[PDB]
Design a protein around this ligand. Structure first.
Ligand SMILES: *[C@@H]1O[C@H](CO)[C@@H](O[C@@H]2O[C@H](CO)[C@@H](O)[C@H](O)[C@H]2NC(C)=O)[C@H](O)[C@H]1NC(C)=O
Ligand code: NAG
Length: 263
């Protein structure tokens, strides 16, 4: 496959994609601040199980806009008001402190977003889009929580900030670990936890951490929607992923692993 490869300095060239890099991408950071817009664009060959997603949120007077689009054809990365949502961010701690400024979405297909991440919670609330929406998806284990919600109606993302400790136990229990089979996901590190909220599937996923080529694995609790290559790709920076989810407590046990015609 081939794609444009561009550094943020605006210099680009055609890149012959490495074996198993099967996507092209454009990553875009846009910052509007009291009159000025700044923009940084990267392009490159990427590894699949990624989707298109965008997000805009307020920090003080600034607006920050994050975007990735991906595509499959040679050089397909070449060239490139509405619903009212709540918005806030974490850098200024505005999500957490409760100062939630209002934000009109610039595009008809954007919806209200809420996205929580931690391994120091990071909270971003604003306008954006993903293929799922409206919907939500989520994963948590002993030290990890990722959550995403999209709503189709006005200021629907208003509310206290979603924290794991306020979702009641599901009744489902699943094995918990992250790392590889020797480090972080050894048997001594893999143990049962109580699932919470709508995260009522046991999950295991393996793929290749993208930044460095190492094997990665994760186990825990998930929404059914989390059991999806792109979402796991996004959340853990992974690719060429095998996922399984199952709805019997402990069915996440590493001794119950089975490859899925990856194959
Ligand atoms: C992300 O959305 C882009 C935007 O269209 C998708 O790329 C489009 O592909 C269709 C089919 O070739 C074309 O009509 C458009 O020309 C493409 N858009 C542009 C601007 O080139 C792309 O497929 C999406 N990524 C995924 C995986 O959904
Ligand atoms: C597994 O985990 C750590 C690094 O993540 C490392 O010490 C070990 O060698 C890894 N195994 C492989 C195959 O990368």
């Amino acid at each position: 496959l081939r794609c444009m490869q561009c550094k943020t300095n605006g210099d680009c060239r055609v890149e012959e994609c490495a074996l198993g890099q099967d996507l092209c991408r454009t990553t875009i950071v846009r910052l509007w601040e009291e009159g000025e817009e700044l923009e940084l664009v990267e392009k490159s060959c990427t590894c699949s199980e990624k989707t298109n997603r965008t997000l805009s949120y307020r920090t003080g007077l600034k607006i920050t806009s994050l975007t990735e689009v991906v595509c499959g054809l040679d050089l397909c990365n070449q060239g490139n008001r509405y619903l009212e949502c709540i918005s806030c961010g974490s850098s200024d701690m505005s999500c957490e402190r409760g100062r939630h400024q209002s934000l009109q979405c610039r595009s008809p297909e954007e919806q209200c977003l809420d996205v929580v991440t931690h391994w120091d919670d990071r909270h971003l609330r604003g306008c954006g889009y993903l293929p799922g929406c409206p919907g939500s998806n989520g994963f948590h284990n002993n030290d990890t929580f990722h959550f995403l919600k999209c709503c189709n109606t006005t200021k629907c993302n208003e509310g206290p900030i979603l924290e794991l400790e306020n979702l009641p136990q599901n009744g489902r229990q699943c094995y918990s670990c992250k790392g590889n089979s020797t480090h972080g996901c050894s048997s001594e590190e893999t143990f049962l936890i109580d699932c919470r909220g709508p995260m009522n599937q046991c999950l295991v996923a393996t793929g290749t951490h993208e930044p460095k080529n190492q094997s990665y694995m994760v186990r825990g609790c998930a929404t059914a929607s989390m059991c999806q290559h792109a979402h796991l790709g996004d959340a853990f920076s992974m690719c060429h992923i095998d996922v399984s989810c199952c709805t019997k407590s402990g069915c996440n046990h590493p001794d119950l692993d089975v490859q899925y015609r990856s194959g």
